[PDB]
């Protein structure tokens, strides 16, 4: 059930929308139209300090469909960067053998943007693992992804659940990413 829900979520509708103008709706949403589609973005509580005005121009939005309602409003969470510019090539390394075998393959993973939300990085990394290695399709959801930055900061993502909404606004400077360690089939 949860494995299938993850498969569906991480292969769902997404759009990268560049140079967006948007208006605040209520205290913690943004609204805009893109190609005529009504988009409402929930701003996670952690990111309130960045969004202290009523209208915006030049936003970069990574849309992931959480739902579409009766009125054809399409809802997404976080994924907004105010001043983005569009190559970072951190090494992605994968460990995917059953049991002890420590065999690992590392290769460059390309990021075109100067800044990237944890939301977009999480999503695209999972889609990569779904498509290349069968994550949630032919292998289990028991894995982890550790994104390390040059200063020693890191984000450890649990592949057994969806990224939480509260973390979908975090912005990462793409050139700071040192490496991405993926451990799969953790039993």
In the chain, domain spans: 1-11+84-187, 12-83
Structure solved via: X-ray
Of the candidates 160, 151, 148, 165, the one whose C-alpha atom is nearest the C-alpha of residue 7 is 160
Query: CA 148 to CA 134: how far, in whole Å?
Result: 24
Question: What are the Cα distances from residue 61, in Å, to 77, 152, 158?
Answer: 10, 27, 24
Contacts of 44 (CB under 8 A, 6+ apart): 77, 78, 165, 166, 167, 168, 169
CB 172 within 8 A of CB 115: yes
Query: CA 117 to CA 111: how far, in whole Å?
Result: 11
Match 């020693």 to its residue by tokens.
152
CB 139 within 8 A of CB 133: yes
For this entry, resolution in Å reads: 1.9
């Amino acid at each position: 059930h949860d494995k299938e829900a993850l498969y569906r979520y991480y292969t769902g509708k997404t759009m990268e929308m560049k140079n967006i103008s948007a208006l605040k709706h209520g205290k913690n949403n943004l609204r805009f139209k893109f190609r005529g589609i009504k988009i409402q973005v929930l701003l996670p509580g952690n990111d309130k300090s960045k969004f202290q005005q009523r209208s915006y121009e030049g936003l970069d939005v990574f849309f992931v469909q959480e739902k579409r309602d009766k009125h054809d409003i399409f809802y997404t969470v976080g994924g907004v960067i105010q001043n983005n510019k569009t190559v970072s090539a951190p090494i992605l390394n994968i460990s995917k053998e059953k049991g002890e075998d420590a065999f690992v393959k590392g290769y460059p993973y390309y990021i075109k943007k100067e800044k990237i939300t944890l939301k977009e990085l999480d999503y695209k990394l999972r889609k990569h693992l779904i498509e290349k290695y069968g994550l949630y399709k032919t292998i289990s959801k028991d894995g982890r992804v550790k994104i390390s930055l040059k200063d020693g900061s890191f984000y450890n993502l649990d592949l057994r659940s969806k990224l939480k909404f509260k973390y979908m606004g975090e912005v990462i400077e793409s050139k700071q990413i040192k490496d991405i360690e993926v451990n799969l089939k953790l039993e």
